[PDB]
């Protein structure tokens, strides 16, 4: 079921950017295919241009990895819409915690 406010994002990820990190999960996805949207520091606010999400699949991808040395937990806001044409967004706060890279 789509119910998990907290999320995890690796740091110092190396490979091919932009790169995907984790899928998103809302809630209204129990009545109609809901699409996503993102806004807040990391997307539109400084640092602007870091995280990006697919309003269709809800895949959370980023152009820049995270850094525990800088921030241990990032926070973003998102909106929801019905792939049918009806808006179903709501002030949703997504919490993204940082986790040790695959290196350990």
UniProtKB/Swiss-Prot annotation:
Disulfide bonds: none annotated. It is found in: Cell junction, Adherens junction; Cell membrane; Endosome; Golgi apparatus, trans-Golgi network. Ca(2+) 2 binds at residue 103. It comes from the Eukaryota. Residues 1-104 form the Cadherin domain. Changing residue 16 to P: Adheres to and takes up L.monocytogenes InlA coated beads. Expressed in inner and outer pillar cells of the organ of Corti (at protein level). Expressed in granuloma macrophages (at protein level). Expressed in the epidermal keratinocytes of the skin from birth (at protein level). Expressed in non-neural epithelial tissues. Ca(2+) 1 binds at residue 103. During apoptosis or with calcium influx, cleaved by a membrane-bound metalloproteinase (ADAM10), PS1/gamma-secretase and caspase-3. Processing by the metalloproteinase, induced by calcium influx, causes disruption of cell-cell adhesion and the subsequent release of beta-catenin into the cytoplasm. The residual membrane-tethered cleavage product is rapidly degraded via an intracellular proteolytic pathway. Cleavage by caspase-3 releases the cytoplasmic tail resulting in disintegration of the actin microfilament system. Homodimer; disulfide-linked. Component of an E-cadherin/ catenin adhesion complex composed of at least E-cadherin/CDH1, beta-catenin/CTNNB1 or gamma-catenin/JUP, and potentially alpha-catenin/CTNNA1; the complex is located to adherens junctions. Found in a complex composed of CDH1, RAP1A and PKP3; PKP3 acts as a scaffold protein within the complex, the complex is required for CDH1 localization to mature desmosome cell junctions. Interacts with the TRPV4 and CTNNB1 complex. Interacts with CTNND1. Three calcium ions are usually bound at the interface of each cadherin domain and strengthen the connections, imparting a strong curvature to the full-length ectodomain. Cadherins are calcium-dependent cell adhesion proteins. They preferentially interact with themselves in a homophilic manner in connecting cells; cadherins may thus contribute to the sorting of heterogeneous cell types. CDH1 is involved in mechanisms regulating cell-cell adhesions, mobility and proliferation of epithelial cells. Promotes organization of radial actin fiber structure and cellular response to contractile forces, via its interaction with AMOTL2 which facilitates anchoring of radial actin fibers to CDH1 junction complexes at the cell membrane. This is Cadherin-1. The gene is Cdh1.
